[PDB]
């Protein structure tokens, strides 16, 4: 049994069959699997032909847009000691990774970065979503616009003396036009002042009513000095038609933050085609837990 089913020497069999059997079976499986592979490949090529290169066929799963942030906090918590320098390194490395893409050296020449209004403006349509007029042109976004959080003056960006910054960003969507709320009698309290139509407002607050007092002065930095995103950087034409495209950014400094205590800060964008979700805590708004323990 044990030995014979492994190798007998009269019928010259190994495991059960002879050499010609193992060959017939191996050849059959090779031809069979080869045909299977060729069929799967053909059915995948016709799929590459069905879709378009400048536009995803379905855009219903990404609307409205989200709201991400740098730094990269795990569990949405930013906790660091003002003494130990090896505490906020994981944060700075991220912040830096994000801002390192807005370097002026990258934005140079006429293409594909054209100079746009230094003050918020309206939309800009560079035609349709075609290859007719080549690669489109995107507006330039300078680092310096963000005044105290730019890594150009205080590389750390604030984490060094108990005053952190948070660079907020709106998720890039193809053909998405941001629509801010109008001046009618119905509008939140906050939004009334500085109604710059061409600016999409972003405003942070405290999750709980108690924490209000423990949160100090939220100082927003942005294009034109407003707390929002200029409508001129829209819409987005997609990677293929707009490589080297930069999305606006908004810096937020949480000055006067109480020491040794977990503070829940919820930031929220406002606008018509903006809707929040009780399940996705990053759709339109975002939450951050800050605790500058020193």
């Amino acid at each position: 049994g044990w030995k014979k089913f492994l190798w007998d020497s009269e019928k010259k069999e190994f495991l059960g069959r002879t050499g010609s059997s193992w060959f017939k079976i191996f050849l059959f499986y090779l031809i069979f699997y080869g045909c299977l592979a060729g069929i799967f490949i053909g059915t995948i090529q016709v799929l590459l032909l069905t879709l378009s290169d400048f536009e995803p066929k379905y855009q219903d799963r990404v609307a409205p847009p989200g709201l991400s942030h740098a730094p990269y906090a795990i569990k949405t918590e930013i906790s660091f000691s003002i003494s130990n320098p090896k505490s906020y390194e994981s944060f700075v490395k991220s912040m830096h990774k994000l801002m390192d893409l807005y370097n002026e050296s990258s934005q140079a020449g006429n293409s594909p970065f054209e100079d746009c209004s230094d003050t918020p403006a309206d939309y800009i349509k560079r035609g349709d979503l075609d290859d007719s007029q080549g690669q489109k042109k995107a507006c330039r976004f300078s680092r310096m616009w963000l005044k105290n959080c730019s890594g150009l003056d205080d590389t750390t960006y604030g984490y060094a003396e108990g005053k952190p910054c948070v660079v907020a960003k709106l998720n890039r969507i193809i053909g998405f036009y941001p629509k801010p709320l109008k001046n009618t009698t119905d509008l939140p309290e906050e939004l009334q002042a500085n109604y710059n139509q061409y600016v999409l407002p972003l405003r942070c607050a405290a999750k709980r009513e108690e924490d209000r007092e423990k949160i100090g002065s939220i100082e927003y930095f942005g294009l034109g000095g407003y707390a929002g995103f200029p409508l001129q950087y829209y819409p987005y034409y997609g990677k293929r038609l707009q490589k080297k495209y930069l999305q606006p950014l908004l810096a937020i400094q949480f000055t006067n933050l109480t020491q040794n205590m977990e503070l829940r800060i919820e930031c929220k964008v406002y606008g018509e085609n903006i809707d929040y979700s009780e399940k996705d805590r990053f759709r339109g708004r975002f939450e951050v837990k800050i605790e500058v323990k020193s």
Partner: protein
């Protein structure tokens, strides 16, 4: 409980005297024992009652079923699942729950299967109890010289016991004085006729001597006395029942096929794991994560619906059997009949009816045959001659037995008749084709009768003649044909009378040897008209002197009789032989009768010959002929006692038609074992207590329901509540039919495996988002698959099943490599490719092309990356990409159902084509329809994305699996085509299950 001392053949103290007997146990032959002494012994050794069986509680029989079949594979699966939930729970407060569900589900599949199998085994036990009836009985013992009737449980060894025709022998007695006493030794020894019990000794074998009465036997006619020699469990049938209880069950064939199935399934589990272990190490992973990967692949190779599907499969065939009155106590004993290849049967009570019936009749120099079948479905014997009428008058008058009061309801053959078995058989035949004997008897008043004499060897009587024109006297007499032949000189031919010349005397001799050679007992009937001139109507013929002419009578004709076989016995034996089943007769009856019944039922085909037959046909000694020229052999029990193991092997190896006669119960077991030592399945069919040890050791015991004993009924596995023998043929057919279907259902439930594990393998090796979730596999594993798999049992035959030879156990298994090559190798592969197609389509239509998916898993699963760029440059949050992955799981599950359509159709038939067999199975059609309705329901009901996580699909995605299905259908169709045109070719020895 020494078995070797119980396996030995019975010994005794029969060859003794009445003085030696009374001197050994202590007892007055004329006064019996004293009451004080009787109680001293009653308390000294125990009541004369057999021990009750070893009982068992119901929670016990439920634990047995919980730790059985493959409930072990699943018990560990459950334990492992809850272990992972424990560790995952105490390690993090946010762990996935694919394990608390996977475990409660797995566990339910085991608890539910146990409840169903249980309910079945209890259903059969209740109907088994409603048959165990026990009306108390009491014996007649003589103590201090007085007769008293005491409970059967108070009889001891030594007292005097008297019996009377109609009562039961209480314990093993030693007859001391008898008065024409006869006993029925059919259940214990197997003797169809009543053996007379005489105080004298006759044979060295205790079962053959007449000076010993036995336990559970009954005294038919006469009265007798005797000293109790054996009492309680120490009796003959007590040692036999003790042997039955102290034997094993065996191991069913179906249980061995399932065990081999688990063997292969685990083989492939450790193979896929050690291989993906070396492969993962070749890719850069550490030893802890790689070890956990080997665990997940082994757990995926577990068919959970295979247990519930197999259980329901087996359960369906048992109901078809219960509709025709064939009840099985266990659940797997339903398949053993189909795999049987050697049926060992019993004669008395199983092959026969254990009741005497008039078989052949002689009259008008012509043999006439009568119907000897239970339901009277045959040929009449021409009731138009006057001779037959005179015969009816002779037998109906010269007979003293009468039906038992109150039988006006039962049929003419099954009613109770008080008297000998010969007068009863004659009374039944006359009452059958001559109407009411009670009026035939009152129509002619019996004047004087001279009872049967040991010297006269005849029974005669005179009665008045009902002829209103003839007031003479009629005289009738019956007896042995030789004695009656010496008392006649005329013959009633066609009505008229004729002389007894040697021509008809020789025709009578040949008729006597014809009915005698048939194993039947013949009797002669004659009558005569007494002259009213020499014996007027007033003269009284007192039974003292020669008042009737002994000679010069008128012989009318002979009347034979014998116990006939059951209606469907010859046809069933022929059907079994046609299917290649060796029929071997094993009975404890006289060989002269066993050989005749064997030739009459088909065991000894007409034409075959024994060594003695050849020696008789040639007129030479028996030691000269060669035993190889004899196909059939009659092995006597006395000779069987002195035979080696090899000799029995040669007896079964060289003789095709074997008949074991005069074999004791202990010997019956040796014969069954002699059949099994060589490699095959055995089915023993019996009824009495002598059959108890044979039914237990046989692969499957078949006990009679009405004519069977309680011990053999409790030790058997299948019961025939209607005592019909054709059920055996039905069983051997169903046993095969339900086998080929299990093959189909297993290949079906195994094909769906591959498309269930490949996604995870490409996930860990290729780094792509998870294609098939766990709650979806559960939905296919216990949803879609089941109804269809259950329906595959209702498939009819393809070719004649009652025409192929029995399956070889050492080579044709239930799950071979030819199946694995199909399910795991060819069909499952195509199904997996179709699933991966619908997947890529869903992700490409929303934005993730196939080039950007490789290498994304690490960031696709991060809960803190709210900006994942797709092939077009769009930014997707975490929950948004997860919704798409879930919709890909829903479409993957639907693709599985689509390919399962063609798999259920190619699994419907093994060889034949669909355009031949046909889609006449309504259950399969219902399975497909329900299988589709369930998938649509799980994908479009409000609230599934919160409970089960299945999102709605767009109508264009449901058509991504259709081409793969069509291809599966075309491939399997051409596969089944080359097998038909090319028998024995590559496609057959490579893909023919």
């Amino acid at each position: 409980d020494l078995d070797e001392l119980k396996k030995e053949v019975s010994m005794d103290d029969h060859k003794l005297s009445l003085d030696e007997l009374h001197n050994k146990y202590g007892t007055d032959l004329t006064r019996g024992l004293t009451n004080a002494r009787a109680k001293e012994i009653l308390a000294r050794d125990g009541p004369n009652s057999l021990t009750p069986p070893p009982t068992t509680p119901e929670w016990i029989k439920f634990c047995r079923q919980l730790f059985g079949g493959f409930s072990i594979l699943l018990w560990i699966g459950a334990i492992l699942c809850f272990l992972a939930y424990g560790i995952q729970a105490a390690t993090e407060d946010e762990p996935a729950n694919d394990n608390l569900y996977l475990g409660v589900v797995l566990s339910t599949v085991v608890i539910v299967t146990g409840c169903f199998s249980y309910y079945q085994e209890a259903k059969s036990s209740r109907i088994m109890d409603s048959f165990k009836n026990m009306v108390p009985q009491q014996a007649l013992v003589i103590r201090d010289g007085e007769k008293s009737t005491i409970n059967a449980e108070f009889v001891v060894a030594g007292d005097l016991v008297e019996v009377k025709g109609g009562d039961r022998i209480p314990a093993d007695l030693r007859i001391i004085s008898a008065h024409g006493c006869k006993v029925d030794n059919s259940s214990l020894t197997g003797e169809s006729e009543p053996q007379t019990r005489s105080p004298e000794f006759s044979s060295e074998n205790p079962l053959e001597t007449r000076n010993i009465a036995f336990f559970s036997t009954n005294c038919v006619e006469g009265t007798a006395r005797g000293v109790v020699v054996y009492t309680g469990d120490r009796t003959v049938m007590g040692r036999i029942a003790t042997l039955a209880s102290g034997l094993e069950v065996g191991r069913t064939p179906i249980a061995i096929e399932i065990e081999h199935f688990i063997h292969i399934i685990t083989g492939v589990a450790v193979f896929l794991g050690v291989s993906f272990f070396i492969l993962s190490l070749i890719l850069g992973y550490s030893w802890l994560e790689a070890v956990i990967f080997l665990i997940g692949i082994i757990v995926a190779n577990v068919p959970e619906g295979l247990l519930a599907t197999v259980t329901v499969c087996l359960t369906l065939t048992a109901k078809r059997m219960a509709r025709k009155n064939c009840l099985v106590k266990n659940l797997e004993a339903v398949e053993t009949l189909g795999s049987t290849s050697t049926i060992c049967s019993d004669k008395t009570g199983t092959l026969t009816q254990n009741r005497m019936t008039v078989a052949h009749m002689w009259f008008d120099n012509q043999i006439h045959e009568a119907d000897t079948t239970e339901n009277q479905s045959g040929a009449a014997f021409d009731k138009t001659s006057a001779t037959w009428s005179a015969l009816s008058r002779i037998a109906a008058l010269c007979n003293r037995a009468v039906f038992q009061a109150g039988q006006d309801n039962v049929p003419i053959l099954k009613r109770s008749v008080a008297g000998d078995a010969s007068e009863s058989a004659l009374l039944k035949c006359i009452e059958l084709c001559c109407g009411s004997v009670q009026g035939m008897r009152d129509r002619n008043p019996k004047i004087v009768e001279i009872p049967f004499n040991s010297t006269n060897k005849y029974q005669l009587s005179i009665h008045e003649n009902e002829k209103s024109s003839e007031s003479r006297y009629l005289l009738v007499m019956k007896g042995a044909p030789e004695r009656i032949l010496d008392r006649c000189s005329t013959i009633l031919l066609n009505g008229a009378e004729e002389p007894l010349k040697e021509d008809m005397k020789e025709a009578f001799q040949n008729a006597y040897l014809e009915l005698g050679g048939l194993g039947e007992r013949v009797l002669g009937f004659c009558h005569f008209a007494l002259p009213e001139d020499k014996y007027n109507e007033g003269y009284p013929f007192d039974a003292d002197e020669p008042n009737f002419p002994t000679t010069d009578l008128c012989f009318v004709g002979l009347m034979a009789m014998i116990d006939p076989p059951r209606a469907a016995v010859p046809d069933a034996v022929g059907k079994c032989r046609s299917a290649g089943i060796k029929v071997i007769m094993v009975t404890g009856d006289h060989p002269i009768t066993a050989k005749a019944i064997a030739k009459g039922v088909g065991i000894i085909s007409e034409g075959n010959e024994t060594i003695e037959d050849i020696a008789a046909r040639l007129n030479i000694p028996i030691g000269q002929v060669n035993p190889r020229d004899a196909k059939a052999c009659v092995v006597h029990g006395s000779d069987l006692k002195d035979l080696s193991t090899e000799v029995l092997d040669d007896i079964l190896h060289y003789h095709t038609e074997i008949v074991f006669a005069r074999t004791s119960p202990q010997q019956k077991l040796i014969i069954v074992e002699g059949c099994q030592r060589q490699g095959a399945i055995v089915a023993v069919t019996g009824d009495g207590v002598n059959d108890s040890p044979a039914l237990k050791k046989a692969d499957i015991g078949v006990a009679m329901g009405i004519s069977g004993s309680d011990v053999s009924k409790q030790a058997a596995d299948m019961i025939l509540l209607d005592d019909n023998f054709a059920s055996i043929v039905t069983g051997v057919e169903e046993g095969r039919l339900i086998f080929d279907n299990l093959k189909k259902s297993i290949a079906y439930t195994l094909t769906s495996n591959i498309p269930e594990i490949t996604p995870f393998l490409v996930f860990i090796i290729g780094n792509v988002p998870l294609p098939l979730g766990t709650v979806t596999i559960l939905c296919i594993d216990l949803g879609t698959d089941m109804v269809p798999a259950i329906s595959l049992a209702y498939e009819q035959a393809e070719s004649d099943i009652m025409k192929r030879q029995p399956r070889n156990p050492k080579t044709d298994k239930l799950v071979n490599e030819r199946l694995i090559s199909m399910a795991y190798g060819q069909i499952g592969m195509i199904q997996a490719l179709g699933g991966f197609f619908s997947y890529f389509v869903i992700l490409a239509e929303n934005g993730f092309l196939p080039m950007d998916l490789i290498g994304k898993r690490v960031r696709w699963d991060d809960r803190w990356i709210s900006d994942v760029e797709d092939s077009f440059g769009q930014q997707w949050t975490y929950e948004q990409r997860k919704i798409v992955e879930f919709t890909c799981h829903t479409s993957f599950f639907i693709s599985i159902v689509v390919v399962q359509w063609a798999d259920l159709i190619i699994c419907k038939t093994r060889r034949n084509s669909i355009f031949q067999q046909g889609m006449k199975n309504k259950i399969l059609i219902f399975g497909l329809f329900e299988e589709t309705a369930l998938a649509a329901f799980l994908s479009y009901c409000p609230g599934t994305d919160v409970a089960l996580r299945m999102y709605p699909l767009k109508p264009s995605w449901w058509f991504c699996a259709f081409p793969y299905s069509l291809i599966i259908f075309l491939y399997d169709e051409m596969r089944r085509f080359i097998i038909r045109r090319s028998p024995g070719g590559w496609v057959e020895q490579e893909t023919y299950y």
